Amino acid sequence: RQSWLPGSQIPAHLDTPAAQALAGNFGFDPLGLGKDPVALRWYQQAELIHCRTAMAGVAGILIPGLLTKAGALNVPEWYDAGKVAIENSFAPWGSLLAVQLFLCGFVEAKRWQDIRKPGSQGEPGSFLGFEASLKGTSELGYPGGPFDPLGLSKEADKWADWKLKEVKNGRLAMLAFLGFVAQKYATGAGPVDNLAAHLKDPWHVNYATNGVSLPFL
């Protein structure tokens, strides 16, 4: 099957009904960190979290920064946008900080209790009407109701397809964020500008030429 490395052997725990049935498996586990079932399940959830968060972040970086290259939508650099926003704001940053901590903490605790017991927050009467749709959809990391409103989880055909594309694009978004911050440390410039420069001359616009990544040269 599609392997992260042909010829090489497949990790046993990765070569399992659950794992190969999880998503996007390629036998990629050199250090063998998901031999425990609970562990690999936790890591699957973790990878999901990171995928989605990174997708969101890279979108919020590029699209506004992309259209600021366009005439409209004058937005600052992403890293300075924090300063820009706290300037243009009204509430103190520590305040709004603590508030959003409360907010995220509650729902994160929800996700937590549900991972502990899939039928945990379905506890009837615990909320007024939540429990009904607040139950999982038999796949931890795939809730229902408000989650998937349009009802795209019902058609099994495109199911694994959505899944594979999800995990793919999420990992790629992680990598995108990493490249952005890395070239912000090295080049110090916005990623769009880094791209423009590498377009103007790839032969001389690269980490090979930065003398930063590879200083021994």
| Binding-site positions for chlorophyll a | 4, 25-28, 42, 47, 50, 108, 111, 144, 165-166, 169, 171, 183, 194, 198, 206-207, 210, 212-213
In 10 A of CB 109, how many CB atoms?
11
Residues 6+ apart with CB under 8 A from 38: none
Asked if residue 116 binds other proteins (CB under 8 A), the reply is yes
Contacts (CB under 6 A) with ligand CLA, residues 30-89: 34, 40, 43-44, 46-47, 50, 56-57, 59-60, 63-64, 75, 81-82, 84-85
Nearest distance from residue 164's CB to ligand CLA, in Å?
10
Query: Tokens 């999880």 label which residue?
Result: 22
Binds 126: which of other proteins, ligand CLA, none (CB < 5-8 Å by kind): other proteins
Token pair 């900080």 is found at 97
Smallest separation, CB 73 to other proteins (Å): 10
| CA separation for the pair 33, 43 (Å, rounded) | 9
How many angstroms separate the CA atoms of 103 and 168, rounded?
29
Under a CB-based contact definition with an 8 Å cutoff, are residues 75 and 65 in contact?
Answer: yes
The helix-helix angle for 37-69 and 191-200 (nearest 10°) equals 70
Q: Would you tell me which residues interact with ligand CLA (CB under 6 A)?
A: 4, 14, 19, 22-29, 34, 40, 43-44, 46-47, 50, 56-57, 59-60, 63-64, 75, 81-82, 84-85, 171, 174
